[PDB]
Amino acid sequence: ANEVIKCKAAVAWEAGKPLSIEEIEVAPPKAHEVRIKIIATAVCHTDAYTLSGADPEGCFPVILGHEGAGIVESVGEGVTKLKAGDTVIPLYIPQCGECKFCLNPKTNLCQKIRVTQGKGLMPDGTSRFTCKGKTILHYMGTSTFSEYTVVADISVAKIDPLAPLDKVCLLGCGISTGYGAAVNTAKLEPGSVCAVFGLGGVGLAVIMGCKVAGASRIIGVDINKDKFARAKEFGATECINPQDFSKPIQEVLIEMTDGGVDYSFECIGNVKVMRAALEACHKGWGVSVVVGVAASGEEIATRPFQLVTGRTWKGTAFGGWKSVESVPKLVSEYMSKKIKVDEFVTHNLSFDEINKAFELMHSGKSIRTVVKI
Amino acid sequence: ANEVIKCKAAVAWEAGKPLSIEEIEVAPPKAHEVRIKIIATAVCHTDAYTLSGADPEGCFPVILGHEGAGIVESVGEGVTKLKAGDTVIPLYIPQCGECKFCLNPKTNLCQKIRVTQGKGLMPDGTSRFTCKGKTILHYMGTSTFSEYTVVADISVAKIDPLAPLDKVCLLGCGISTGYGAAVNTAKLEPGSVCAVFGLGGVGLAVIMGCKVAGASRIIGVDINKDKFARAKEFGATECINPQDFSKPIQEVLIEMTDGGVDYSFECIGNVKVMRAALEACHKGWGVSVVVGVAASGEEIATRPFQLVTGRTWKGTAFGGWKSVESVPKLVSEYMSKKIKVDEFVTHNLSFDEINKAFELMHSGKSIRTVVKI
Ligand SMILES: NC(=O)c1ccc[n+]([C@@H]2O[C@H](COP(=O)([O-])OP(=O)(O)OC[C@H]3O[C@@H](n4cnc5c(N)ncnc54)[C@H](O)[C@@H]3O)[C@@H](O)[C@H]2O)c1
Ligand SMILES: NC(=O)c1ccc[n+]([C@@H]2O[C@H](COP(=O)([O-])OP(=O)(O)OC[C@H]3O[C@@H](n4cnc5c(N)ncnc54)[C@H](O)[C@@H]3O)[C@@H](O)[C@H]2O)c1
Ligand SMILES: [Zn+2]
Ligand SMILES: [Zn+2]
Ligand SMILES: [Zn+2]
Ligand SMILES: [Zn+2]
């Protein structure tokens, strides 16, 4: 492309300050990039973190957002997999397909863009987001909170065009992560007992995952009781509340399964609940997965005896999926009714009232606020 | 059997006090037990712990020892797998073959005798070791520091009779553990980089394991430099000393492999070196195994990011081997020259001078002191 699209966007000028809708100048695709016309974007706890200012590495001003879905407005020099009009989903973990991590089947962490993406710039150390002369930094390689964005050649996952754009976008984060957390990482086995700590979005995708995997007793765990209904609806055979007892939560779970759960996923991001989750697993074979990100400096811990008695401690990023190859498939899984997606959108908003989304989040009302652009 | 054998043994009357050779009355086999004539027994750091008195659960007086090998003096009512004259090796982890843990291929932790063994008694809550009227408690189900011992039906692994009894006994502990730590637990893959923290006995069996497994760069790590020669002899391509640098050991290992080791085993039993080992593994797929037992209350820890970036934390008991089925096979592996064993015996002693073994241990001179009974 050549022309400079001027459009609407939700810039975040200074941390701690509400996203100000703004007009911006989205430059045209440089070699191996694609400009995407957003059609829907949701809000995640992740976006909240950066805006919160607590993100130690959160440069501003930045056009946040990563759960998006849209049409390709145009491609840059040297691109071939995409074309103007293709229905896509940007991704925050690329799949260059030729790096040390992309060539290995044990991980999905493509490093080819790690450092440039980190500095809120494109693969050439520059941004495409101009505004009133000032330079706005891209965010997580996606920058969905914009009518038009510019992502690198390798961050796009082309998808089914008849895919409800205002829904499939939840596959660029929460859903996938939790689905893979049960399907990829843990590689859960039919008939196994499980326990899910944290019944928000990510947690729900895990309960879903355990089900399609064919579990036999998924146990949801959350402090806020309101989360219980959808949990049980999604597959959870039971739901308990830590606050409801005097014994430590691990001691409760154990008694309930005479030994411990076979698998256990921590989807909150609370170190104290992380070691709690691990210690609730069964002796000799219990496995624990960390799906929730944590605060800088917070560190997990436990007595090594746990691991010596036979307990594996694992973690996961984007549920394991090699982005570009997987996302497209997940959409099929959706269309063919194998997995749920709409069930996650608890609220719809209009672009103008973007800030409202960050508002319902702070109240434990939402599972995923979807915003029409 | 019926007669009460009166013989020599090394009783430990009170913690902190040197093992006093003594005459004792070893009662005859009760149903489903076997009396074993010891012919050789070695000394392990484990035995030191109990005697040290620091073992929170170390009831006295006790006839310690677990690395033994001998001939079956006689069997008790209801036994059939053994007979007077069979060459055997007692084990501290049984294989009842029908419990919740024995029936599952993910672990080797037979629980059928856990509580009784713990109280230093036989499966019927009584001991076979009488002495000057007093009751001496059995230790780890084996009690090898005795001319004659009594172990339960399920703690015996029948072996190759032409097996050098004064050597194969090292398979009842250190060797197996470390071999399996690389072969079973980690299931190491041909061509992989590795790092071994602690070059004592257990550590050496891991270096051995990584080799037969077909590694590609085993890195030994120890504080005491004297351990380096045998390490390199066993398979280690290089050996480094933590104390030799100013950077944290993890930071050193990383630079040496441009990323990290693929696998990493901690064989010391030092929590600080445990998180150190884990953090030295490679991003996205690195795996860490805890083979070393630790002090009561000491707890491992790290930032969850490690696990989220793709790092598995594992632990192991007896290297994974389902005792009774495996031990016999390991002996074959020995005889058929597939694995080393003699290379571990750095000192031979006579029963009378048993205490000397605990002495060389306290000096980092030994890898395994073998004692002829
Ligand atoms: N590792 C990754 O790749 C990855 C990817 C996406 C999201 N995440 C992270 O996963 C975590 C989950 O995010 P989310 O999107 O699901 O939404 P969320 O914030 O809505 O989920 C929060 C849930 O945890 C519950 N909770 C809080 N304290 C609890 C406690 N002490 N015990 C039990 N439950 C408790 C809250 O009540 C709520 O139910 C976050 O840390 C997010 O950053 C990680
Ligand atoms: N998990 C199990 O099933 C199992 C089984 C058998 C033994 N073990 C345990 O494994 C561990 C190893 O025992 P061992 O028999 O091999 O003999 P050991 O005591 O001789 O090995 C000690 C080695 O660790 C080294 N070391 C000490 N501090 C170090 C440090 N800070 N950094 C690097 N190296 C250091 C010592 O110098 C020595 O080389 C012990 O804890 C033992 O109890 C565990
Ligand atoms: Zn998100
Ligand atoms: Zn890549
Ligand atoms: Zn031992
Ligand atoms: Zn058993």
From Swiss-Prot, chains A, B:
Family: Belongs to the zinc-containing alcohol dehydrogenase family. Class-III subfamily.
Cofactor(s) listed: Zn(2+)
Localization terms from the record: Cytoplasm
Residues bearing the modification N-acetylalanine: A1
Organism per entry: Homo sapiens
Signal peptide: none
Disorder this protein is connected to according to its UniProt record: AMED syndrome, digenic: A form of bone marrow failure syndrome, a heterogeneous group of life-threatening disorders characterized by hematopoietic defects in association with a range of variable extra-hematopoietic manifestations. AMEDS is an autosomal recessive, digenic form characterized by childhood onset of bone marrow failure resulting in aplastic anemia, in association with global developmental delay, intellectual disability, and poor overall growth with short stature.
SUPFAM superfamilies membership: GroES-like, NAD(P)-binding Rossmann-fold domains
Catalytic activity: a primary alcohol + NAD(+) = an aldehyde + NADH + H(+); a secondary alcohol + NAD(+) = a ketone + NADH + H(+); S-(hydroxymethyl)glutathione + NADP(+) = S-formylglutathione + NADPH + H(+); S-(hydroxymethyl)glutathione + NAD(+) = S-formylglutathione + NADH + H(+)
Modified residues (N6-succinyllysine): K232, K314
Record-level GO BP terms: fatty acid omega-oxidation; formaldehyde catabolic process; positive regulation of blood pressure; respiratory system process; response to lipopolysaccharide; response to nitrosative stress; response to redox state; retinoid metabolic process
UniProt-recorded name of the protein: Alcohol dehydrogenase class-3
Entry binding sites for Zn(2+) 1: C44, H66, C173
Modification sites for Phosphoserine: S246, S323, S350
